[PDB]
């Protein structure tokens, strides 16, 4: 039985990041633009989109 390991997402505020290939089995990486995440302390990012 496999286990799915999911590292902490990189939340880049007021900017953009790019995924890179890595030597991991079935590695997946995707950049979701236009996020406005909230944490316990409120809005994480300043820019709306």
């Amino acid at each position: 039985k496999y286990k799915t390991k999911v590292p902490s997402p990189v939340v880049k505020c007021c900017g953009a990041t790019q995924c890179t290939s890595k030597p991991h089995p079935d590695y997946q990486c995707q950049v979701f633009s236009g996020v406005y995440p909230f944490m316990y302390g409120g809005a994480y990012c300043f820019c709306d989109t």
């Binding site: 039985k1 902490s8 939340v11 316990y40 300043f46």
Partner: protein
């Protein structure tokens, strides 16, 4: 000794992470469930949470647990710490981030604890199944029967070669650091920590301040404040923002590793056997779905396999 099992866990702290159901609605729960391991046979499941059990800010104590209360880490005695899937689970043992519970089948896994008048719970959708050992689908470990090898999560905390990585915490966004003060946004820096601030008012200003800083912007909404405090590390939870650079700081051993164990499997009632010319007649009266298999001892096995659920 007990402290030898917490040498690495003392360097980690609890954290608040997204929980799909904090009672009636989604919230950032201090008891957020990260993973549910439920592949053991006799319904043993290991639940990984964001809360720390068995540690206090002052040291190790299995009677105490530690959880985040906002930016401040709170340490309290374990009070009504419970695990529920479809009915209350018996707790076997607990360790930093990990709870070992004896749960019946269910569609959900609920973990929660009490802190005086407050109640912190986290319910996640996870099919927990009871996996009987052997050829009988018993629904609860029987009192007596045939002892068979089985897979169980051991109740021992000791390191058995399984580890998880703990990383430097990412930016902890917390707007309570900003105050209008004299109509002029002030950044309050907790002692020993650094506060990253980002203001995009007409006077765009950003940077890392170690001490109370008065910015040019007049409205809290114009600024964001993130607490940078690396004294204690956190598991690289998929629900926490990653920090900058190489955030890897160490390894935390996985308690209650899966091990081979001996489980008591049910023993179906002895069949009634009647004999006829070249024919064997069996009257089967099972208690639970019991597998019956037969084969000829000749050149053609002609195997038969069927589950007997009723007489």
């Amino acid at each position: 000794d007990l402290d030898t099992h917490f040498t690495q866990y003392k360097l980690a702290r609890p954290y608040i992470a997204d929980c799909p159901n904090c009672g009636h609605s989604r919230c950032d729960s201090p008891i957020a469930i990260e993973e549910v391991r439920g592949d053991a046979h006799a319904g043993v499941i290991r639940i990984q949470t964001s809360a720390m059990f068995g540690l206090k800010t002052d040291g190790v104590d299995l009677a105490y647990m530690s959880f985040m209360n906002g930016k401040t880490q709170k340490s309290i005695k374990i009070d009504n710490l419970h695990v529920r899937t479809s009915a209350p689970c018996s707790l076997v043992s607990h360790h930093g981030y990990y709870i070992l519970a004896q749960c019946p089948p269910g569609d959900t896994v609920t973990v929660g604890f009490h802190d005086g008048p407050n109640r912190h719970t986290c319910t996640v959708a996870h099919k927990v199944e009871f996996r009987p050992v052997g050829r009988e689908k018993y629904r609860h470990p029987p009192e007596h029967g045939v002892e068979l090898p089985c897979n169980r999560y051991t109740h021992k905390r000791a390191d058995q070669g399984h580890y998880v990585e703990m990383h430097q915490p990412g930016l902890v966004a917390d707007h309570s650091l900003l105050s209008i003060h004299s109509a002029k946004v002030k950044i309050t820096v907790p002692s020993g920590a650094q506060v990253k601030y980002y203001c995009k008012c007409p006077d765009v200003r950003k940077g890392i301040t170690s001490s109370d800083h008065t910015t040019t912007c007049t409205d809290v909404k114009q600024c964001r404040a993130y607490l940078i405090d690396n004294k204690k590390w956190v598991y690289n939870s998929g629900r926490l923002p990653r920090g900058e650079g190489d955030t890897f700081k160490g390894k935390l051993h996985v308690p209650f590793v899966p091990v081979k164990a001996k489980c008591i499997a049910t023993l179906a009632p002895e069949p009634l056997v009647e004999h006829k010319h070249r024919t064997l007649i069996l009257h089967l009266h099972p208690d639970h779905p019991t597998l019956l298999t037969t084969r000829s001892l000749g050149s053609d096995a002609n195997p038969t396999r069927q589950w007997i659920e009723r007489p």
